[PDB]
């Protein structure tokens, strides 16, 4: 038979299951519990089509970008001011305070959860809108990292009604 209920597991499997039990059982605080309240997968598909337009460049693209500037017009006027996603918490907290960020989009999963407890209030006090999205890994794919909090300070003209 399948006895996959009754298996004496290793300690590491038993720990990463008894965490998920223990965080259901205990009374969670309202601030920590904020990230149980999340977008629908149809609501999240509406972001990931949008945010893929404003994708910051790969590290290999910096070479090819710079070969063009290495001077076809003249200095930094070889292009316009390039618009993209801003990322990494310690930039994006500054970018909320000085009041540039249009939307500020966040992971529920973030593992030391202290990192992101304060951010939903910051956004609400300044009147910046924010979301919560299922998966810090999904937000990582846009940025070209492994894994919290992404923001749009600036847009194109074409995509600004959306």
């Amino acid at each position: 038979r399948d006895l996959s209920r009754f298996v004496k597991w290793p300690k590491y499997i038993l720990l990463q299951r008894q965490r998920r039990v223990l965080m259901q059982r205990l009374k969670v605080p309202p601030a920590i519990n904020q990230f149980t309240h999340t977008l629908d997968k149809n609501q999240t598909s509406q972001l990931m089509r949008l945010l893929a337009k404003y994708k910051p460049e790969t590290r290999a693209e910096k070479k090819q970008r710079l070969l063009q500037e290495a001077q076809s017009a003249g200095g930094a006027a070889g292009g316009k001011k390039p618009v993209m996603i801003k990322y990494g918490i310690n930039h994006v907290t500054d970018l909320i305070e000085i009041k540039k960020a249009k939307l500020v989009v966040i992971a529920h999963d973030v593992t030391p959860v202290e990192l992101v407890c304060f951010i939903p209030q910051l956004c609400r006090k300044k009147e910046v809108p924010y979301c919560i999205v299922k998966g810090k890994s999904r937000l990582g794919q846009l940025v070209h990292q492994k894994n919290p909090v992404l923001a749009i300070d600036n847009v194109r003209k074409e995509d600004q009604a959306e």
């Binding site: 399948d2 006895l3 004496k8």
Partner: peptide, 9 residues
């Protein structure tokens, strides 16, 4: 998950 037969890991 995989269907496992032995109770032991």
């Amino acid at each position: 998950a995989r269907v496992r037969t032995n109770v032991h890991f």
